[PDB]
Amino acid sequence: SCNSKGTPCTNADECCGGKCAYNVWNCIGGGCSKTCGY
């Protein structure tokens, strides 16, 4: 059970590829929503 890119998560495990993290310019690390890369 995994997820795909563009999907919200809290850990890399949530991503079949292992790329869980948020990438924003107006969302400093600390209260954001990480997304899948692969």
Retrieve residue 26's tokens: 């107006």
Experimental technique: NMR
Relative to beta strand 8-9, strand 20-21 is: unpaired
User: Mapping DSSP to helix (H, G, I), strand (E, B) and coil, where does residue 15 land?
Assistant: strand
Closest CA to 38 of 15, 11, 22: 15
Instruction: Name which of 26, 29, 9, 25 is nearest 17 in CA terms.
Output: 9
List the strands of the sheet with 8-9, edge to edge. 8-9, 34-36, 20-21
Per the structure block, which two tokens stand in for 17?
């590829």
The CA–CA distances, whole Å, from 20 to 31, 32 equal 15, 12
Residue 28 vs residues 1, 8, 23, 32, 33: alpha-carbon distances, Å: 29, 17, 9, 8, 11
